[model samples]
Target chain A: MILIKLGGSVITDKSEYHKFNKETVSRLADEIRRSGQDVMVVHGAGSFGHVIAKKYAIQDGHVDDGQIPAAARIMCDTRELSSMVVEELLAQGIPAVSVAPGSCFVMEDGKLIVDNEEPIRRLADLGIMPVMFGDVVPDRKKGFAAVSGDQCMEVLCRMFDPEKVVFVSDIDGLYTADPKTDKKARLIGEVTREAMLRMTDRNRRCYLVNGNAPNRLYSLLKGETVTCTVAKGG
Target chain B: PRGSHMILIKLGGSVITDKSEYHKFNKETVSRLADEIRRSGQDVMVVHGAGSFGHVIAKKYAIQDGHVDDGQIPAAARIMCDTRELSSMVVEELLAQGIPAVSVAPGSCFVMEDGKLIVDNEEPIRRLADLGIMPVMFGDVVPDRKKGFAAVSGDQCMEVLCRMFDPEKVVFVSDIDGLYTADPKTDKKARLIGEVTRKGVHSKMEAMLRMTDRNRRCYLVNGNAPNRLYSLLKGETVTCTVAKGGM
Candidate 1:
């Protein structure tokens, strides 16, 4: 079972609200549907998520950062994105079930946790793909908090016990320096767990990919050899 | 102090429900069992498994408490009672069939002071029994000292009751026939051991039979046909295992 995430940032550009490269995303979503691998799709709120999150001041991570019902606007937007994504997947005859993170996500004293054995096992048993995404979740101290798509993947990977996880992004692979600015920045093909951990410690394993990069995600799904860079650990 | 006259009936969740129907039970059959007990005119009490309601809430709230959470007490109370109300609807039907029945909140009456039962109102129970009313109860979670609360099985309550009021007989109505020498359901040639006793008689009865505590010589009856409860209560000596030893 594979779990893929289409990030909110990649879904929409920050400056332009409601503007997204919909054609590119739609084509990519179509490829994912045809992969024939039992997979779940989690998308980030590009235009829908950030605006409401900013309106509610959600990222400050303090008790006082909480607002009244404006926080609900963030949840509503995330759910809307999830619904739109689900509609796309369903349109392709993919039997995908929408699992709203805000509603279904369980926590123990503000820490996001789950008994993934129950729901994950059930979904897998029925051969139905369960799609989940990051959304504002209720916290005991902070009232509400945001979960990222990366963290969402980590949790799902641990719970679902998947064989391999292939993360697809625009730039294709890891680069030591700003690949765009430096001619020496080369795509390192293979990564190691120890090396990834060291880079992640410095908050740097995250890749930069253009949403318009054609056939790049499709190549990863096809398991093709790539000249992409690698940083592996954790 | 005399022991209480209560027998806990622990029924499996599957027996009470069809999984395809999302665990909804055959109410007519369940009500029929209640009806027989009501008509038997013996001092009997009922404790049923949380078939659908408990399962639904547990799944909805993602609670593994095997019951409900104590923090959701008001909700749990309303739910547990509502769960009992589903069975209570059957209880009322049983009463209409001349079974003097009532659903009392054992949590309201049975108090646990330092991990022990400090029952508040035994007189009310005795009064009901004297008037031939069969009080019904179920497996429940009560507040605890070491832990917040725990799922208290109805079987344990029956053991406690046996230590108090040694009833003439304690019958456990089950799906399987009095455990066979082989598999009773499958083996037509298997013999039914009319008696069971000893520390491991349950395990020793057959390779694949139900086991129980050594001291309790309880009869195992098929709950599928609830009218068997009436037959046993009437001392008809129906097809049941007469627990091997003295209670």
Candidate 2:
């Protein structure tokens, strides 16, 4: 099995609140379908969460009463966005079952606790794709936590123990400089070992590739060499 | 005494989501109900219906007919995704109201062998409720041996939960108050069925009532009625349908 983490920047424009990049999302979904691999998908909440979360400091838990509505709104917004993503996946004939991570996972003091892993694994084993998104989950210590896609990856990699873990983003992986504006920006094709050390303590065949590149994900899944950054963790 | 005094509540999909529309959640309604549960301070286990979330998509695809062809596959997957979102919203509201609710998807664990539900294990849900954490569940699509996948209605879930917990109280919060003598909305002659025995809009539930340890007053109250839920949670008799369950 393979695990795919779709960056918010790739699926939705981070700077634009609630802006869904359907074109990109469709491409990614097509690529996933074409790959014909039983995969687990975790997506980030770009505009769906970040704007409100930052507006109210939602991840900090219930710091005040006003955050209640904000948290609720974010949850609704994120669900709608996830449904949109799921719709695209369905159009591509992918058996994608959207799993709300907030319900599946929990947090305390801003740290995720993977308590609901077995059912998700069983879903994947039954040949259904379990798609999760960054969410505002219930917290034991704090009232809520703004879980990130990376945080989800941290747990999914541990749960699935996939042959490969792919992080799809807008640019060609991490670069020496922002690839958008820097003419001299160089692709960090292979992330530094020191960086991997900072990433995780778990062993994984992790890579960072551009979702915009088209078919790169399929290639990676098929064991073909693709232009991407290797950020393997051990 | 922590796990003692257990009650089972079913948030009817029609009340939580606007069944007429697609995926419209009644956030204010759920919030109010959650607050009521919190205020009542009861050990409650909640199971909700998919309403518009899974129903529309499933009906369109005829997923209840099960996997006749590879065509129903995507719809089955969508049903699981949709109901999950609905349950998540319910959990969020409960948490917001200080209820500490956790979502347990029926599709995740429950499997159907030739359309007969086998609740693989409800131990986890019971464990959560035992910890003072309200375990919220909902109707969803599940794997089936005969067909590829099938829909598991909330009533189907009630059958199992009502049997296992024998919850001191079983309340189904719906849009309509009690089982009326007729369509109350259209006919003025309709009178509330003050009390009932072995029943259904869901026959499987009625079927479960025939053979089980669930011997109690199952309350069917209108969630749309303000303070009606409050009374029910407090064990106060109100205007609603009360059904006899089990032998």
Candidate 3:
């Protein structure tokens, strides 16, 4: 009934941070366990992302499709990273299943071509966590390439018919201006489809958050009306 | 379906890595065999045994950690990767010859509970056949419940894939020269059983009863001579062989 995305930036610094933040992951797992609701976690490959994307020289599309070695390597890394997440959840007594895009999804030209929707759908029906992450999947034109978590979540949302889609970012939420550089910038508490289109340069400003602030999210998922939290973007 | 012949080439570990061949494959012959599969215009699936790759890890960590290797996780992973890489190379060679081949790793698709294979995916493979893109399957290590992990053999995979796709024939090209009536070289009376009925082999090799099946017909030809495969596909009998419905 719910779809959650763990932003890539929040989990690992794709630029510098080299390893998984165990504390953040554990805390996120605890929050998920406390909610006691069925959730499908779509995680981003942070540290592992750029390595795979760059290794395959993956800049999107299926240009360098024959790099099977790089493709397999990246996909394997994505699986290992996702497995770590599943293992953490299981350690916290959360039964989770690993759904790699390569194995469960078939990609064509860097987009979802065919989805193994049966198993994932069944997992949700059974109240199990179908944990997925960014992966390097096979493509018809290009042998294999990287797939983002954001796209994965959107696809799942359409399939699972989630009540709400929550993206846990590092910042409070979307902001009017850069909080750091603009003193007058204010946090926008709500976001709608119309406002999203009118927003100025959200691509660079959006700071995906870690799951430390669990109370607000827990309430939002329960169908209780709450202010959508968007923060300063300087 | 013109140009629509399909053959299943079961490569042993010795062929892939050739670890026993000074621990490397007979690269020349290996590539030649791959080329032949392509040249024959027959859709082919290359199913390989775990060989050294699967054996090493399964014998080592699998004995202790099972599926979730406590400390040997990295080692276990290496085993899977190595086999996949070796198999992929063979796949690429076929593709390079315009065979339009793809590697269908077993661990990702099929699930084995006890010692039996229960297929989970069937459409994609059949679709490949329709498109003339040969799919290559192999002996792989699969996740298990009781043992945590188990080795899925090439023959085991053939049983599942054949049942699902029910291909025209399941050709097992092995190192040995087909089936002998008794003992080929030693027993002067041993004759090559060219064709056999499903029940014939079952009762003939009572001790080998576990090897025959009704719906599936198997051919054993000398894997060393690549042309033997070409001849077998045409219903040509090769030296040292076994067949269904008696020949």
Candidate 4:
């Protein structure tokens, strides 16, 4: 089984508002189906979440009653994106289902406390692909806050301990230097999540690869070496 | 105080949102219902109907036709997505009152065969209740073995949950006063039936009313009357139709 995270920046154009790249998601879905592995998907909320979220400083939690309405906006947008991803996946005959993250967890002081993962576990157990996304959630101290897809992936890796945790994004994997400017910058093949003990025990691995680069994710899924970074720890 | 005791609450589409429009979320009614739930102070699992959001999209896409064409595939996905927006509104209202409410979608787990339930994955729902968290599900789109994808009404979801959880009590918050002899909105002579037996509901028009109307020991009350909801939840007498039976 594999756990995949579709970075928001990869699925949707973040610089735009509410623009979805259905072609990209459709292509990725083809690769996922070809892998022929039972898998689970988690996606990021790109233009859907970051647009109004940044305007309202949603991560800072509710500053006033006005932000409360914004909270609903961000939550709804993220759920919309999640549904689209599931739509494309389903269109590819993957038996995909959308799980709303807005109500799945609570963030208190910028930390995540999953409200329920039981449903997620049961859905995956039923041979269905469960798709989740970054969303706005109620916060204990801050009143309400946004939970990112990365934070969610971190929690899921600990829970599922899958064979591989793959991050499909718009750029190449982590580089030694700024890949955009440094001509000598190169992608790191193997790295750690953040360390020694966390890395030593687990046979599971994490990969960061470019989704825009055709077939790179497919290559990694088939256990072939690809132009990507692998993180072992955590 | 926090035991395994739990109840099921169904917020009918007619009450929570104006079905005449598209994606119209009534924060006013939702907040009132949330306040009533807050006042009752009970472990309640909430299920809401797709009023303006889903019913509208389903009509546009003719989702009942199933996966007919490749272009119509998005109807299934949009149904879940647009409805999630409405469900999120209700959850946010509960959060405003500091209720630890979590949304659980039935579309993800329940198996549908030709538009009917083939399997019910209620274990996770029970697990959530055992942990003292309120699980909120709503009317959603589910995959069908025959149809590819189909709609599950909120009332149908309530029937599934009521049977699985066997909730301590059940409430159907409606826009009308209660069950009436006729369409109360049009006929002045039509009177609210304070109580109706399972036999009474099933014998007359089981197909006309919500499926849960057949479920044992249920109440249909006016959601606009928030105190009535609180009173009923508190085990007090209120003006509502009670469907009493075992089958």
Candidate 5:
């Protein structure tokens, strides 16, 4: 299995917030179809998530009665985006099913613990691509927490043991510094597990590629020349 | 017990969406109905049909009976996607009207086998209603143990919910005023059947007559005009039909 995370930045207008790039989404859908891999997709909330989540301080977890509305709104926004992603994938002839994270997960101390993996495993075994997104979830310690797509990616990696884990983002790949702010920023083409562990303290084979440029995802998955960051276990 | 006074309403797709146009939602009518429901101040749980948003793609892919082959997988997935889109639209409209409408996708909550509902955990829905939040559901494609995937209609969802919630009322909001003595469109002399007994209900629409009990009552009302909804809920005279078991 191959797990793919479509970064919220590439799919939605983060700056404008609440605006989705339909063209890019559609193109990415096609690119996903072209790769033809048995895949599971997890997406970031982009503008749909952070803005509302921050407003209610949802990241703090223990939601008061007054904050439930904010949590509900966040769920609605994320569902709207995930629905579009699934529709686009269907339009591109890919069998993609939207799996609501809140329905299947609970956060404990800011960590996602799966309440049910049966539905997800069932869909994947039946040849259906399960599409999940970042969203608000009930927490064991806190009332609710915003679970990120990256966290979901880690969970999938642990559960499915995917051959490839890819993060399709707006940026080309990991950089030595904030690429947008630093003139001296340089892209790290590849990094071993030891270097990645030093940087973020995780051992996994992951690839980061620019999703804005059409077909970059497809080319990378097809094992062709592509400019991106490659991080592998030491 | 405001929660015990709750009612389950099924909004047909024909009334909420432009059935003739693929994926077109009748925003004006839907918005009006939302406003009426909000003002009515009734404890309600809503279920809506797929209409153009669902049937077009569902029929094209032949997903009702479930798709078995790998080639038909996209059809099943699209059905799931389109239904969620419709549910989201309905939830947003309700939210905009100050109705705490939370979407509960049937595919996630229910599982079926051979078109028979077998697995449905009503705990979450019941919890939402207890908190004064109106849980909204719609016709959706769910995984079937027998068929891989199946189309579960809004009526089916309502039936399951009606049995579980055992609400004081179950209303079917449709395009017409109510069931007529005959096809109202063609029969000039036909009159609306104001009340249907249990036997009559069984003969006409058995789906509505299930789990007959003293407190069980079903209503059919015109959804085209939103005001009728407010009037009907308040027990005022309205062009509608009521179904119940023999007293």
Candidate 6:
């Protein structure tokens, strides 16, 4: 099994924000369908989640009664995006089901406590592609907190032990600096887990490829040489 | 609690799906009901039953008892997926009819302690209604503090919302027209009770009404007859049972 992370920046215009690129998403769905791989797609919230999370300080891991409404908005916003993604996938002849992270996950001290993986595994076993996205989840210590797609990817990797993990981003690959702003930035061909372990554990070897480059993901899945950063081990 | 225009509607499983067939959704019936709800022009919050989708899987696993073992995890998972499938279908039908209906999973919003809700779903429900959007919930398999998980009935959601929002009216749209003295299909002498008081409801539903104190009016209308829903919303006399609340 393989896992794919559709980065928010790749699917939505982050600079303009709130704009969903339906054409790009549809094309991606078509590509995914043609690959015909047993894959679980986890997507980022793009404009839907980040803005709401920032507005409500959701990532701070503490919310009051007054912030509950915003927390709900954050949850619903991601689900709306998940719905669109699933609908497009279904339109392209891919049997996809949208699973809301908020509904299935609970966090304790900013770490995932309630991990409902059986449903996801069941969907995969039935030949259905399950799609999940970043959203607000109930926190044991805090009222609610925002969880990201990267974090979800790690959890899923540990649960399913996928053979390969792919992170599709706006840029070609990981860089020493923000490639969009730094002129001296260079794409690092190979990234190791030792570098990422400081931030989050490297569950498995992952590939960071530019989602904007059409056919890049397909080539990678076909076991062809692709220009992307390969993260080794932790 | 601040909203005076909000109305809580419970769409029964029997009315929305074929109870005999697992996961069989009555699209035509659901679509027509959505259209009627749209035409009614009432600010609505919908709570629907699991009908065939959840009940079948739940019964097979004994989920309602909440005694889930390691072997029953997949069954519980299937129940969650099945219930969401039904909810997605309902939301799609409502959207097709131009109702801005948002799906609110009870498991995400409400926590049950011995089958009683301890969280407040009012904030979100009220916010949605205030925005002129319908927040839709359904009978779902929710995680329980007592058990690994439990089956939350749609009526439980309706009752909780009724208590929180203090909606002026609560309507139960079911397969049958209304509450009858006896099973209308089996009893020829059974009569449709046009009006029922709090005492009458309490006598029959004492355990369920223990926490309910506010006097709120409720209606039992036939979901098959979509016009009855619209008529009731318009405050017109309809061939349905009216359950009046009193001290």
Second chain alone, TM-score for each candidate: 0.67, 0.89, 0.77, 0.87, 0.90, 0.89
Q: lDDT at B203 for candidate 3?
A: 52
Per-residue lDDT tens digits for candidate 3, residues A192-212, read 432222222333122233355
For candidate 4, write residues B133-236 as lDDT tens digits.
Answer: 46677888766656666778887777677667666677889897788888787889977777654345344335323333334367888998768888999899
C-alpha TM-score for every candidate: 0.43, 0.71, 0.55, 0.63, 0.88, 0.64
Model 1 accuracy (lDDT, Cα): 0.52
List the RMSD of every prediction in angstroms: 18.1, 5.7, 9.6, 8.1, 3.5, 7.8
Lowest summed lDDT across 10 adjacent residues in model 1 chain B is found at: B207-216
Considering only chain B, what TM-score does candidate 5 achieve? 0.90
What is the overall TM-score of model 1 with all chains considered together? 0.43
For model 5, how does the per-residue alpha-carbon lDDT over A83-154 read when each residue is reduced to its tens digit?
A: 888878778877777777665456777787764566566677666677778987656556556788888887
Error of 1 at B221 (Å): 49
- For model 2, what TM-score is found for chain B? 0.89
Better of 1 and 4 by lDDT: 4
The Cα local distance difference test for each model comes to 0.52, 0.75, 0.58, 0.72, 0.76, 0.71
lDDT of 5 at B181: 67
Please list the residue runs of candidate 4 whose C-alpha ends up more than 4 Å from where it truly belongs after superposition.
A1-4, A8-41, A44-97, A100-130, A133-166, A169-171, A175-186, A189-234, B1-4, B118-120, B198-216
Residues B1-247 of candidate 3: C-alpha lDDT, one tens digit per residue: 3222445557666455544422244566557767666556555566766566566666666633455534444444444455555565665566566555555555545555677655655555554444444556777655554655456777776666554554555676666575666655577877666655544434543322233455435666566786877676666666744444322
DockQ of each: 0.01, 0.21, 0.07, 0.15, 0.39, 0.11
Q: Write the per-residue lDDT of candidate 2 for residues B170-237, one digit (tens) a residue.
A: 78899988777567778898667675664424552354344334455677899999899989889788
Worst 10-residue lDDT window, candidate 2 chain A = A192-201
True contacts kept of each: 0.00, 0.25, 0.01, 0.15, 0.31, 0.04
Clash-forming residue pairs, model 5? A61-A143, A61-A144, A62-A143
> Best candidate per lDDT, number?
5
Maximum-DockQ candidate: 5
Error of 4 at B14 (Å): 0.9
Q: Indicate the TM-score of model 6.
A: 0.64
Could you give the candidate ranking by TM-score, starting with the highest?
5, 2, 6, 4, 3, 1
Which is better, 1 or 3, measured by TM-score? 3
